[PDB]
Design a protein around this ligand. Structure first.
Ligand SMILES: *[C@@]1(O)O[C@H](CO)[C@@H](O)[C@H](O)[C@H]1NC(C)=O
Ligand SMILES: *[C@@]1(O)O[C@H](CO)[C@@H](O)[C@H](O)[C@H]1NC(C)=O
Ligand SMILES: CC(=O)N[C@@H]1[C@@H](O)[C@H](O)[C@@H](CO)O[C@H]1O
Ligand SMILES: CC(=O)N[C@@H]1[C@@H](O)[C@H](O)[C@@H](CO)O[C@H]1O
Ligand SMILES: *[C@@H]1O[C@H](CO)[C@@H](O)[C@H](O)[C@H]1NC(C)=O
Ligand SMILES: *[C@@H]1O[C@H](CO)[C@@H](O)[C@H](O)[C@H]1NC(C)=O
Ligand SMILES: [Zn+2]
Ligand SMILES: [Zn+2]
Lengths: 493, 491
């Protein structure tokens, strides 16, 4: 039969295309298929009753509008309860919640506040009297709070003022330049209070306490590591910060044995002198030797379009190799976080691949370069895909037009992470796993995709091969517990 | 170290060597034009990256059109022989202005405001139109009783055109903009299907596409339903011969033109019975008119409507036959953001049915194996940038889903879907967006020339015709290089 022969050739063709996607080799137990069919049901319900009933597919909307919807979906609770592996792309000063800074930090002593000339609130700590500036009229948060009338209103205005999701960012800061302006204001509002050593040591623990409470067991954080200041005025160095994080991490691992651990990546800004960037590469070289397991490598952060390139820093980033004997400072570069093509920003991909990076951040413009894409696969370089950030920071509006979706469908080395979840009031990793589930994979791909993501966060991490084996075991143990309790609570008895 | 710099430059030359047109060798005259385009291209790219301002080439076409018409590069492209336009829809391939200044000034034309506050036009030579949900009035009378004849004839365009308001702000959802897009055609159906008015609109198409230095067109048409003043409704072969007569008068008047060929189009919301009859009419028209008739295609919005598999019994009929026949196909496919859906999987049906070209193919990059097979078989994709933005597949054109494929020499051609619906040029406005949004900062004229040559290689002409068509383009192309360089280079 001509129809029968056609349908056989068609099914072979489609199944040969779908056999090359990410997670196509995950074989699920019948118990795991129960969860898979619960997720695929709601996924297909929203996909199909939005395609045919001709309505908006809320999972792909602005996170201001989708968050309330996502927080009422039965699948988001499954992901909330899922051991997601590791979050491999984080920035320290925005990986915990603003409510802790409003409720804990701004209730401490010696906390002043002021409204800058842009009508934004700023916070700082000064134990040496009133703060020394007059572009701002600093007042004590303690007194200004009591003299209001409704303390909760004072503490809600504080959060609304320093959050980016108090208004729809795609409407309040419509241009990429504007949203990066509000994004930069966010950090300047909090710098005077997050770099005080007592507040920072407690803030970092809040990161670990929250990321485990979202069933994430491993984190690789990027930090400036220097500038922690005390009440007496003393400002510390970088090695102080690394050991402050190392002390909190080990107290945590001892307290919670289900956690895998944390590791640190030093970050420098893209707009600072080549002299300082070499100075920081030197700090990373020594810190990597002194702390071989807690310290991973170096990265340059900050807005990628209007600031410098990776070639502008070649004398520094090649310094570890010209040494005799040659040294290896591992790199974790941001690269190609742009819509531009065949430009400096787009071409930072080649420099990162030739500087032998271990993972690439964002990598939005990798698909635009055929050979660059092939080479990264051959060498094993994985891309850290951060979906929600790529929407708010203005690389795409509909997440379904993400530039790495084609790569996911060809089993490309990829992991999923957030970037600065606390700025836009997002969950540690659940909200970004959900967006990938509904916007970055197909209608016939739910749990094979998610499980491969968790496994790739361990395979393409910076742990030793010995650690990675011992890390998957802990994740496996918690994963089977997650399948067991979920299926027990859904399947009839 | 210089050693690192050598490895870096080798890698870039290894990647960029795979772009579309990377093997085009430009004459020294052609290189001057390439440099004039690249100069303005990089200035606008780098002013926006560093001063942190908006890159208008990638904005909504409502806001970029005014800017584009004051750029020195658009005039260079306006003067370029672009080859062939291979994805056109007849009812929107000529200006709305022609309908207001010619058509609504003919006799027996009535107008009315429908229940949605949109204008509708129709022709009835037998008195007032046969409907009463609208109070039909003579366009002459409503135009006369207005205090300004120009205001009425500008409102007549403003209340039936899609670029009168920013489509991305007033009709923000895919449902809403496609609603206005469908309303556009229902506004004009009563006047574009009158046999005299349609025959002249098609003439306007060929004149307008030639006046934009496009030498060949492959237009998709319903081809049936042309009505006369008495009411006679015609068949498809009448339409095909109506187009064929006008085309051959055109080819004789302007011997610099290459020609035109026709593809039959059916809608995605009609019964399998109706689509089967259309497939049968297409088979016979292919035999009867072997040079002017090419094949069949199914059009209309792809997301809420049917698939190509729901019509398999019809589209295999040419093959289940003794002796077997081959009806060529020109399917639309995967004009969607969805992944692993019925819409998205229409590519497997198209590739197995030996389609000659695919329309849009926005989700072809999401399917690894589907892409490779089309490359071996020679199936090319018709990329329409401005269509995909206004109709809500992408907002920033630089996020177009086919940019990666262009960078690995994938067989592609460029066209405008419905240039008159959104007040765009025949082919220049869609070429400019490709130049500024779909390729890199270091690629201007090699890419454009390869597109012009691809419209002839990946056309439906015979191997004999293609050779004589390339020659006609070649002669016109070199005169374009000479005159353009003569007007820019010093003496
Ligand atoms: C703009 O920033 O950049 C141009 C080069 O990128 C430069 O010539 C121009 O002066 C800048 N625009 C201003 C300052 O308006
Ligand atoms: C019509 O505009 O254009 C025709 C050619 O397509 C021409 O014959 C006719 O005279 C024009 N009519 C008017 C009213 O301008
Ligand atoms: C006069 C007035 O309404 N001022 C508010 C200010 O209190 C608030 O801190 C700020 C947050 O951006 O928004 C301004 O509109
Ligand atoms: C340090 C650096 O940038 N690159 C080195 C490179 O010199 C060497 O050829 C390669 C061998 O695998 O190892 C990389 O780490
Ligand atoms: C805030 O946090 C630290 C631990 O995070 C805790 O010891 C301290 O008592 C808390 N402070 C307030 C004011 O609640
Ligand atoms: C003209 O149509 C527009 C939309 O194009 C609509 O707002 C308006 O109602 C119409 N004109 C009048 C005077 O009502
Ligand atoms: Zn980052
Ligand atoms: Zn079309």
């Amino acid at each position: 039969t001509s129809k029968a022969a056609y349908l056989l050739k068609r099914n072979s063709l489609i199944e040969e295309d779908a056999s090359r996607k990410l997670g196509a080799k995950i074989v699920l137990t019948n118990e795991e298929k129960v969860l898979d069919d619960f997720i695929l049901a709601e996924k297909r319900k929203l996909i199909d009753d939005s395609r045919l009933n001709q309505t908006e597919y809320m999972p792909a909307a602005s996170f201001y509008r989708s968050k309330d919807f996502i927080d009422t979906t039965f699948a988001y609770k499954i992901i909330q309860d899922m051991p997601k592996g590791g979050a491999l792309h984080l920035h320290d000063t925005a990986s915990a919640r603003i409510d802790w800074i409003v409720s804990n930090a701004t209730y401490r002593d010696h906390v002043y506040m002021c409204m800058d000339q842009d009508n934004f609130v700023r916070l700082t700590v000064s134990g040496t009297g009133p703060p020394a500036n007059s572009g701002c009229e600093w007042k004590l948060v303690e007194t200004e709070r009591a003299n209001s009338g409704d303390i909760a209103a004072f503490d809600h205005w504080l959060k609304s003022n320093i959050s980016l999701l108090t208004t729809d960012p795609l409407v309040t800061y419509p241009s990429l330049d504007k949203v990066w302006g509000r994004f930069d204001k966010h950090f300047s509002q909090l710098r005077g209070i997050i770099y005080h050593t007592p507040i920072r040591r407690d803030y970092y623990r809040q990161i670990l306490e929250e990321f485990r409470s979202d069933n994430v067991q491993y984190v690789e954080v990027r930090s400036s590591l220097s500038g922690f200041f005390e009440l007496d005025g003393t400002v510390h160095d970088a090695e102080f910060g690394l050991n402050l994080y190392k002390s909190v991490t080990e107290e945590f691992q001892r307290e919670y044995p289900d956690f895998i651990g944390a590791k640190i990546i030093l970050s420098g800004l893209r707009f600072k002198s080549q002299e300082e960037i070499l100075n920081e590469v030197k700090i990373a070289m020594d810190l990597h030797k002194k702390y071989p397991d807690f310290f991973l490598g170096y990265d340059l952060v900050g807005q990628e379009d209007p600031n410098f390139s990776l070639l502008h820093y070649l004398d520094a980033l090649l310094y570890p190799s010209i040494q005799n004997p040659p040294y290896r400072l591992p790199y974790f570069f941001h690269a190609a976080e742009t819509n531009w093509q065949e430009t400096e920003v787009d071409y930072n991909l080649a420099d990162a691949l030739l500087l032998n990076t271990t993972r690439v951040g964002h990598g939005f413009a990798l698909i635009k370069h055929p050979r660059f894409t092939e080479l990264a696969k051959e060498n094993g370089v994985a891309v850290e895909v951060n979906p929600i950030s790529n929407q708010i920071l203005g690389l795409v509006r509909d997440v379904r037009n993400h530039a790495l979706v084609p790569l996911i469908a060809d089993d490309y080395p990829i992991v999923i992470s957030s970037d600065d979840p606390g700025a836009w009031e997002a969950s540690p990793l659940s909200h970004d796993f959900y967006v990938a589930l509904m916007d970055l994979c197909g209608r016939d791909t739910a749990l094979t995709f998610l499980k491969q993501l968790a496994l790739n966060s361990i395979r393409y991490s910076a742990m030793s091969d010995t650690e990675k084996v011992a890390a998957k075991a802990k994740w496996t143990t918690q994963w089977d517990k997650f399948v067991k309790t979920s299926v027990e609570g859904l399947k009839p008895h």
